[PDB]
């Protein structure tokens, strides 16, 4: 967990303008959070990038999880191997508001982070999921009590988040 260049926002929330895959390789954290869907199909965005860095080992393992346990619920999670990126990968399903899923579930999604002392994570539901990224950061700051290091790849978004937070 050798996080470097983070800006401390609150006692337990840190933020950096960085690619989460590159951070995972440099830091080798205990837990890396994946912005997953309920079937753990990592076809793009953060999920696709993390899977591509494991050379599809995350996807094989995810398919085996789904075969045995069935899909996750929106707001839920599961802990799987982190392969070469981390000791564990916490797959968390935020609501896809662009498809009508309730924004209240974003609090339930962030609540999963509380079972891990330290995590490297993306902003949940801020992708193709269509949630307002600044609102997602507010839910994170209000819900997460353990230590979370957020990697936000876009410098324009990072600057807006830091300006909003101050
Ligand atoms: C907002 C965006 C800049 C950010 N992208 C990344 N943030 C950090 N690391 C990355 C990023 O994408 C390339 C790999 O590394 C982001 C954050 C959350 C979500 C997505 C994207 S999504 O994949 O569109 C859907 C799931 C939720």
Swiss-Prot record:
It comes from Severe acute respiratory syndrome coronavirus 2. Responsible for the cleavages located at the N-terminus of the replicase polyprotein. Participates together with nsp4 in the assembly of virally-induced cytoplasmic double-membrane vesicles necessary for viral replication. Antagonizes innate immune induction of type I interferon by blocking the phosphorylation, dimerization and subsequent nuclear translocation of host IRF3. Also prevents host NF-kappa-B signaling. In addition, PL-PRO possesses a deubiquitinating/deISGylating activity and processes both 'Lys-48'- and 'Lys-63'-linked polyubiquitin chains from cellular substrates. It catalyses: Thiol-dependent hydrolysis of ester, thioester, amide, peptide and isopeptide bonds formed by the C-terminal Gly of ubiquitin (a 76-residue protein attached to proteins as an intracellular targeting signal). The gene is rep. Inhibited in vitro by GRL-0617. It is a multi-pass membrane protein. It is found in: Host endoplasmic reticulum membrane. Changing residue 163 to L: In strain: Gamma/P.1. Residues 1-166 form the Macro domain. May form homohexamers. Interacts with N protein. This is Papain-like protease nsp3. It comes from the Viruses.
């Amino acid at each position: 967990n050798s996080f470097s260049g983070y800006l401390k926002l609150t006692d337990n929330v840190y933020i950096k303008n960085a690619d989460i895959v590159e951070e995972a390789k440099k830091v080798k954290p205990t837990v890396v959070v994946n912005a997953a869907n309920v079937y753990l199909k990592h076809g793009g965005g953060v999920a696709g990038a993390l899977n591509k860095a494991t050379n599809n080992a995350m996807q094989v393992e995810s398919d085996d999880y789904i075969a045995t346990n069935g899909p996750l619920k929106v707001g839920g999670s599961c802990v799987l191997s982190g392969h070469n990126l981390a000791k564990h990968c916490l797959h968390v399903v935020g609501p896809n508001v662009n498809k009508g899923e309730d924004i209240q579930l974003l609090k339930s999604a962030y609540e999963n982070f509380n079972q891990h002392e330290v995590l490297l994570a993306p902003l949940l539901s801020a992708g193709i999921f269509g949630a307002d990224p600044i609102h997602s950061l507010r839910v994170c700051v209000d819900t997460v009590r353990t230590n979370v290091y957020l990697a936000v790849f876009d410098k324009n978004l990072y600057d807006k988040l830091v300006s909003s937070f101050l």
